[PDB]
């Protein structure tokens, strides 16, 4: 019944008392005596120790030890000793402190990933970045879906590609690059662009679809409709020029769908021409932000140790000001697509 | 003087009127008449046109046309035709959208040197963005070898590279991706303040090494005395961090805005510290760091982290900024 202090815990003399933990879980304890007691308590768990064995080395009364212990435990600053039964040499071990800090057993999160199947629909900028994260974190099977070939302008965002790869299919090159980074996983490729809605039937069932393909305009409306009918989870990720966007992560029966919170002849011609000329002002930093947070949601969605951010939300992060905003995309019982 | 509609402009019917633009410049025009006048005006510039010529082409009054024109021009939805002139094409739309001449930005990048001080997760991701964006010279600084454990977030590295020097492999991989640039390596870790003298002068230093714990304090102090711009990026477990972007004479520095037995215990615990690394958090810090570098050198938009340390949460929907403005009383500067 051993507990151990997580390596990811830092403490700081700060203000009147101090801080315990780093990151989202950082807690400021205003009272210097209580904070000193949390330090004396945490110290007793540097080595894997039961509550009582640790208590035996504490020089503080039991009521205080007990309150500090409960504090450390609830925040996952101390964790079950067995949750630390990896090898420091396991390829995925870096991530393991990440899982521990969420109160999960890394071995178990890692087993969920190894057994998962992820369809990457769109192998451009976002697909490149999502698929390597997923590959290097240990998702067991990655199915890459794209019919496009590599051009020279791809190279600003499309991280897995080199000058030498120009002319080749995006799916072949991504596959070569993922297996070079993680040869323990399985990678397959389907030579397809979603031209009609009907094409979506050619895309395999999986734990989740990562949806970022480039054409048509209404690809999400298609994918949404299809996935609702097929009970297929999906995450959309993308950008609107300088804003990085990820979400919603659609979960059948559990979340809203894309279409849930959807609210002159000559003028209409002009709009249609203006919009047909549209090309996004792509920029790797924006691409990379959207892809990273998309991958984070995919890992949490399959690993199950923290709630994905984009459940029932489309999330925007601005690049030219400090601004994140979410769009409500929760379930409407009146929805045309997933409703009544 | 020709003007042209930028390709990154998007229009949609919405509410009482509609949306003009995409991204941070997106604007909700409530008045439908005005919204339609904006589109009729934008339409005259799909192919490049002078003002006077588009005016004759548009079926709207001189008064409205002037107004809609200025609306489009001031938002960089229409740009000088010369800005419309390739490897860096999508970056070009990005600069145009900020009212810059892309070729002039691209020339500033081409002419810049960036030090990458630390070639782990952040350095990997920052250096590849910089290289493919056309930053002219990149100096890679690290004395570490690649381990199988790196691969989770050090994106340029492969299982076949395990055992080689990070600088050497980064250089190869940056050069595979943009053969037009120059890349340098320095086989050096900063284990003492004195080691910072081996790091050359650059437009900016991108600082991101996990250890020593106080590396950023040494860098800060060295850079203030050397008048060396630098930007810090990294993470505090699940929180992505970038900033400050230190600019000599212009911003505050990293130091501006900030019992026997216990200090012993505190020191022991803290010395066992290992960060809870997670590639998504790493990649976010690195991407927004690289955006600030490109903006800092390209001078087309204000970097976000001027005077600011910025955190993006990964387990909450949250960005928070800490003010790092100049302090008269700062122990390092002022």
């Amino acid at each position: 019944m051993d507990y151990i202090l997580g390596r990811y815990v830092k403490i700081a003399r700060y203000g009147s008392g101090g801080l315990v933990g780093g990151g989202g879980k950082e807690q400021y304890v205003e009272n210097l005596v209580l904070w000193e007691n949390i330090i004396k308590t945490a110290y007793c768990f540097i080595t894997p120790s039961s509550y009582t064995a640790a208590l035996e080395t504490a020089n503080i009364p039991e009521k205080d030890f007990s309150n500090c212990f409960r504090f450390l435990k609830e925040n996952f600053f101390i964790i079950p000793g067995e949750y630390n039964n990896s090898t420091e040499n396991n390829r995925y071990s870096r991530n393991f402190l990440h899982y521990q800090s969420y109160g999960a057993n890394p071995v178990l999160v890692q087993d969920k990933l190894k057994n998962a199947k992820v369809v990457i629909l769109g192998c451009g900028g976002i697909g490149n970045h999502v698929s390597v994260i997923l590959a290097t974190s240990g998702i067991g099977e990655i199915i890459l879906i794209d019919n496009d070939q590599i051009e020279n302008t791809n190279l600003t965002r499309q991280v897995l590609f080199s000058e030498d790869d120009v002319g080749k299919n995006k799916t072949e090159v991504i596959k070569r690059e993922l297996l070079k980074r993680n040869s323990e996983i399985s990678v397959s490729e389907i030579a397809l662009n979603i031209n009609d809605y009907t094409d979506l039937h050619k895309v395999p069932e999986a734990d989740i679809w990562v949806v970022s393909a480039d054409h048509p305009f209404n690809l999400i409306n298609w994918v949404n409709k299809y996935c609702v009918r097929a009970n297929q989870p999906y995450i959309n990720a993308g950008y609107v020029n300088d804003i990085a966007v990820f979400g919603p992560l659609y979960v059948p029966g559990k979340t809203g769908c894309y279409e849930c919170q959807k609210v002159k002849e000559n003028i209409d011609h002009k709009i249609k021409l203006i919009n047909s000329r549209f090309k996004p002002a792509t920029f790797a930093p924006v691409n990379n932000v959207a892809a990273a947070l998309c991958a984070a949601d995919v890992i949490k969605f399959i690993g199950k140790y923290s709630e994905p951010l984009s459940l029932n939300k489309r999330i925007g992060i601005w690049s030219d000001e400090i601004k994140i905003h979410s769009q409500n995309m929760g379930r409407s019982p009146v929805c045309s697509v997933c409703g009544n | 003087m020709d003007y042209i509609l930028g390709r990154y402009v998007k229009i949609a019917r919405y509410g009482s009127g509609g949306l003009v633009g995409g991204g941070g410049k997106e604007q909700y025009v409530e008045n439908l008449v005005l919204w339609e006048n904006i589109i009729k005006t934008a339409y005259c510039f799909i192919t490049p046109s002078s003002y006077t010529a588009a005016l004759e082409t548009a079926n709207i009054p001189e008064k409205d046309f002037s107004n809609c024109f200025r609306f489009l021009k001031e938002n960089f939805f229409i740009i000088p035709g010369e800005y419309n002139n390739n490897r860096y094409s999508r970056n070009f739309l990005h600069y145009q959208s900020y009212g810059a001449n892309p070729v002039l930005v691209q020339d500033k990048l081409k002419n810049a040197k960036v030090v990458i001080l630390g070639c782990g997760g952040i350095g990997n991701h920052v250096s590849v963005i910089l290289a493919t964006s056309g930053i002219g010279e990149i100096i890679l600084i690290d004395n570490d070898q690649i381990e199988n454990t790196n691969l989770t977030r050090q994106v340029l590295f492969s299982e076949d590279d395990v055992g080689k020097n990070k600088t050497e492999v980064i250089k190869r991989e940056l050069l595979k991706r943009n053969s037009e640039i120059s890349v340098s390596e320095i086989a050096l870790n900063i284990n003492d303040y004195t080691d910072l003298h081996k790091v050359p002068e650059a437009d900016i230093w991108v600082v991101s090494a996990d250890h020593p714990f106080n590396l950023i304090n040494w860098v800060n102090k060295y850079c203030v005395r050397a008048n060396q711009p630098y930007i810090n990026a990294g993470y505090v477990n699940d929180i992505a961090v970038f900033g400050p972007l230190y600019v000599p004479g212009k911003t505050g520095c990293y130091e501006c805005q900030k019992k026997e037995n216990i200090d012993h215990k505190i020191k022991l615990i803290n010395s066992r510290f290992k960060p809870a690394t997670f590639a998504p958090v790493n990649n976010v810090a690195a991407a927004l760091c690289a955006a600030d570098v490109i903006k800092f050198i390209g001078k087309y938009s204000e970097p976000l982290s001027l005077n600011k340390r910025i955190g993006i949460w990964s387990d909450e929907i949250k960005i928070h900024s800490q003010n790092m403005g100049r302090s008269p009383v700062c122990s390092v500067c002022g």
């Binding site: - | 952040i122 961090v241 690394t277 340390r309 955190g311």
Partner: peptide, 7 residues
């Protein structure tokens, strides 16, 4: 945030 960066 309130604590220094890991790297």
């Amino acid at each position: 945030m309130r604590t220094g960066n890991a790297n």
